[PDB]
Design a protein around this ligand. Structure first.
Ligand SMILES: C[C@H]1CC[C@H](c2ccccc2)N(C(=O)C(=O)Nc2cncc(C(N)=O)c2)C1
Ligand SMILES: CSC[C@H]1O[C@@H](n2cnc3c(N)ncnc32)[C@H](O)[C@@H]1O
Ligand SMILES: [Cl-]
Ligand SMILES: [Cl-]
Lengths: 625, 302
């Protein structure tokens, strides 16, 4: 259920007021740290020398309460971007004062409004404060979905509200954030508290706030409709938005007085509670990955490295993948061994990268399901895993399975195979070097032999996420290129991101690859239609594979194999985010590269602007052969 | 009594009404006091009647002779009825209808209706009799600084806001509000005074310490002067036959001006922000200012 706080601009007795909101059901309070109306002078005598105290005492709460329950608010008289020199200088000193007091109390967050277009000095002062010794305090920029000027009642007879489509104009609120955010150099302590008005704007405006670090959603009591009984509720369109924000696990703030004066304040709250408990409950994928949301991990290299026990264990905890593998083998046996030949034709069947042998079991289950004879090899170069196979082979499989403990590129096989069954696929299909592995293993396939899988294909899609772009930025390590972290892919359950175009295919590979001029390097150009204003932060990678005929695996969200949680998408970031105006095309270029020892990807954006070529010569990221 | 004096309003008969807020310390409350001896203020011990509000007071106005209309931090507008003997001050109504600090109130020429201006950007028209909101107008784009009723018309009043708009209202039009003021976007309006004997003209003070004289009819800035070094927080016209203009400021100074805004008197007796001013209805050369320095000064105006 919902982590939710109360916004007040009036606190007569902090002890009582906090007592009230906690009984109402709130988890925290947003309140001013100095009285909102108590303007203060810093330069000009006499008001300069106003006797103190300048606010209530820090002794009024436990450090515990301050650290956990109280979000500060910048006094609304503080205006660092005033046109008046005196109000600027005064507000500068006033703003440092209010922030430094928030820091002194160790407040978990402090609220600051964006409600005009020019917040340049506001950003400077915040940024100045931020670089004054590394403190944990968060800053919540209060930004409206809709700028108050564009929400106002059409009641000025000589300044009417324009009734004309202003696509970019209706997004101007996001540009406020974007500028402020950019000026403050993408600080991790600067998040969005998104203020929702009475009337929602066009979806494209709401969609601009995907990929953005929304920590808060502010709901004024105003925007609540009233049902028959008397309870406050929200429109069906407001309800859609709440569901979008709940999956971002934002904290919900409630601002403004009670306009449903029959019900307590636990009413407004209890609706949000009713909404969260009444949502589509988490499916198999969503429940498995509920921890990994936007968690950057380096891509596994099962070739160059030896996978740990618990790694193989989760590969194996995926019944849909092995259902599909079992079937793919089942269909191939029948197509190869006519019914009349069942007891006279035994099939030579070679798992390549058998790990702890879930494919070996699938290969048995698939043979007694199709009533045909099979002879099993289990090739596995990971000697730690080969321990687990040989213990299976002795305890259970018997002489049927002939465990081989070597590289499929090296192994001199006794006989050739009818079927080579592999699992060497990464989130980007070919990024674990299934191509190079099944190429060195092709010579011991019979001239009429199948590979399962026979085809895989990688898919790229451009994304916007100033969130994930900040997570990658955060990955700078000493003793290497300061930008190296942008020139490498990450496996990541993408979430709080914006797909800007439909995935297109990048690289396809066939097995067997009978081709006389076997080359596994690639140059693919992609052109992405983009129908929104947004900011490019990188490319999501997915894959599809044909196991046999019409049995397939996909993590491509459109065609995603249902309930299969072995692969998360990959992310190819870029160093500088790229502005993309509605109707413009994102042109990206990808190269798969290799020498004798390494395989790697280089990538570039060529439109609407050119990026730098990422990871040239594999300097920042390579994959070991 | 609280340290920060916000409001100071003389009644018909010469009694002094004081609104005051706690703007620092443990309790951030407010209070309303009446002083039948105007020379006895600010002293609590020699007061005719006083009371504690739930929370501070941003603006205050008389509702006739026993009526006090209050703009509460709480987002409530409060009507306080005086006692039948004028010893007590009793809460008539307290209606939580704004979503943020009520920052300004003004009573309309009739006196059964009034208009509030909140930091929630909305302006509302009130029935003081029925105790409900008649109209709710979101005309502005920023927190509403000041609303001032027409002296003589119920349907007409000014408002100004941090959105730089000065709105002339007229509740008779289907689009009530109308945007007037100088040629270019000057500095923000802060304070509005109607002229008492030309319901066609008014004066506004800005945040840059400039007071300006405006003709609605002619909608052109006839005249202005650089009176204060800082924001102009209040403007009151003298009850005089040919009136004087009193300008309050955050520069802690009172100035009194003629009809061409030339400087006549100037008082730095205050050593904190000058908040309010009312003219003595008994001696039209006495003027009573309050400030955030808890002082109640009585000035003699040549
Ligand atoms: C589901 C998560 C936990 C496992 C793994 C991981 C764990 C630690 C770091 C990096 C990724 N992961 C992957 O997306 C992945 O790489 N899968 C994979 C790779 N290769 C082969 C197979 C397979 N056939 O099962 C699966 C994310
Ligand atoms: C089940 S994930 C991939 C598996 O294939 C194995 N593998 C990768 N490359 C090779 C290779 N060249 N020869 C044999 N096994 C391999 C890895 O050790 C891992 O267990
Ligand atoms: Cl802080
Ligand atoms: Cl976006």
């Amino acid at each position: 259920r919902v982590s939710s706080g109360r916004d007040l601009n009036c606190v007569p007795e902090i002890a009582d007021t906090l007592g009230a909101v906690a009984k109402q059901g709130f988890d925290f309070l947003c309140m001013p740290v100095f009285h909102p109306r108590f303007k203060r002078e810093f330069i000009q005598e006499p008001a300069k020398n106003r006797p103190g105290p300048q606010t209530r005492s820090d002794l009024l709460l436990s450090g515990r309460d301050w650290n956990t329950l109280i979000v500060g608010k910048l006094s609304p008289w503080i205006r660092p971007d005033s046109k008046v020199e005196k109000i600027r200088r005064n507000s500068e000193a006033a703003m440092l004062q209010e922030l430094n007091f928030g820091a002194y109390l160790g407040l978990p967050a402090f609220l600051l409004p964006l409600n005009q277009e020019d917040n340049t000095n506001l950003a400077r002062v915040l940024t100045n404060h931020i670089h004054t010794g590394h403190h944990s305090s968060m800053f919540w920029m209060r930004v409206p979905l809709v700028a108050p000027e564009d929400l106002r009642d059409d009641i000025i007879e000589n300044a009417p509200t324009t009734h004309t489509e202003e696509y970019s104009g209706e997004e101007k609120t996001w540009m406020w954030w974007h500028n402020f955010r950019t000026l403050c150099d993408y600080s991790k302590r600067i998040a969005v508290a998104l203020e929702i008005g009475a009337d929602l704007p066009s979806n494209h405006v709401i969609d601009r706030w995907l990929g953005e670090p929304i920590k808060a959603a502010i709901l004024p009591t105003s925007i609540f409709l009233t049902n028959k009984k008397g309870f406050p509720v929200l429109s069906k369109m407001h309800q859609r938005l709440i569901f979008r924000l709940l999956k971002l696990e934002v904290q919900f703030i409630i601002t403004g007085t009670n306009h449903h004066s029959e019900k307590e304040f636990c009413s407004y709250l209890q609706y949000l509670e009713y909404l969260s408990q009444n949502r589509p409950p988490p499916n198999a994928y969503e429940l498995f990955a509920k921890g990994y949301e936007d968690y950057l991990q380096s891509p596994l290299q099962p070739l160059m490295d030896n996978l740990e026990s618990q790694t193989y264990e989760v590969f194996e905890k995926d019944p849909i993948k092995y259902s599909q593998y079992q079937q793919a083998i089942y269909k191939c046996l029948l197509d190869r061994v006519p019914e009349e030949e069942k007891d006279t034709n035994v099939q030579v069947l070679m798992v390549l990268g058998a790990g702890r042998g879930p494919l070996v079991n699938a290969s048995l289950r698939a043979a007694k399901q199709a009533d045909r004879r099979i002879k099993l090899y289990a090739v596995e170069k990971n000697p730690n895993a080969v321990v687990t196979l040989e213990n299976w082979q002795f305890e259970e499989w018997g002489s049927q399975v002939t465990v081989v403990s070597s590289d499929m590129r090296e192994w001199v096989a006794p006989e050739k195979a009818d079927i080579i069954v592999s699992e060497l696929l990464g989130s980007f299909a070919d990024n674990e070097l299934s191509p190079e592995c099944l190429d060195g293993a092709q010579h011991f396939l019979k001239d009429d032999g199948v590979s399962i899988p026979g085809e895989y294909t990688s898919f790229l899609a451009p994304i916007s996420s100033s969130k994930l772009y900040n997570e990658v930025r955060a990955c700078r390590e000493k003793d290497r290129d300061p930008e190296a972290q942008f020139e490498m892919p990450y496996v990541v359950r993408l979430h709080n991101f914006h797909q800007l175009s439909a995935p297109q295919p990048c690289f396809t590979f066939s097995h067997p690859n009978r081709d006389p001029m076997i080359d596994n390097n690639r140059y693919c150009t992609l052109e992405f239609p983009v129908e929104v204003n947004t900011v490019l932060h990188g490319f999501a990678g997915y894959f599809e594979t044909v196991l046999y005929q019409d049995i397939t695996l996909s993590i491509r969200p459109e065609t995603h194999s249902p309930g299969m949680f072995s692969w998360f998408p990959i992310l190819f970031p870029i160093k500088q985010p790229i502005t993309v105006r509605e109707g413009q095309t994102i042109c990206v270029r990808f190269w798969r590269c290799s020498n004798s020892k390494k395989v790697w990807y280089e990538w570039a954006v060529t439109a609407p602007v050119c990026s730098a070529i990422h990871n040239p010569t594999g300097r920042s990221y390579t994959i070991g052969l | 009594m609280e340290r920060q004096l916000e409001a100071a309003r003389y009644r018909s008969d010469g009694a002094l009404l004081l609104g005051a807020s706690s703007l620092s310390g443990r309790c951030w409350a407010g209070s309303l006091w009446l002083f039948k001896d105007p020379c006895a203020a600010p002293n609590e011990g020699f007061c005719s009647a006083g009371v504690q509000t739930e929370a501070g007071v941003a603006d205050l106005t008389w509702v006739g002779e026993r009526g006090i209309l209050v703009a509460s931090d709480s987002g409530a507008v409060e009507l306080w009825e005086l006692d039948e003997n004028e010893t007590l001050i009793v809460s008539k109504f307290c209606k939580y209808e704004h979503d943020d600090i009520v920052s300004t109130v003004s009573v309309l020429s009739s006196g059964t209706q009034a208009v509030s201006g909140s930091k929630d950007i909305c302006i509302k028209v009130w029935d003081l009799a029925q105790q409900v909101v008649l109209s709710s107008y979101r005309a502005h784009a920023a927190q509403v600084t000041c609303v001032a009723a027409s002296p003589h018309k119920d349907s007409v009043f000014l408002s100004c806001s941090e959105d730089n708009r000065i709105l002339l209202w007229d509740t008779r039009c289907p689009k009530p509000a109308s945007q007037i003021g100088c040629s270019a976007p000057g500095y923000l309006p802060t304070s509005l005074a109607w002229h008492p004997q030309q319901s066609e003209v008014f004066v506004f003070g800005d945040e840059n310490g400039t007071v300006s004289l405006v003709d609605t009819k002619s909608t052109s800035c006839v005249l202005s002067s650089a009176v204060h070094s800082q924001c102009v927080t209040g403007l009151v016209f003298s009850p005089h036959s040919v009136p004087f203009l009193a300008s309050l400021s955050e520069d802690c100074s009172l100035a009194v001006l003629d009809s061409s805004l030339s400087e006549l008197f100037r008082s730095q007796a205050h050593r904190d922000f000058v908040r309010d001013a009312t003219w003595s209805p008994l001696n039209h050369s006495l003027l009573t200012t309050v400030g955030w320095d808890h002082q109640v000064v009585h000035h003699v105006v040549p």
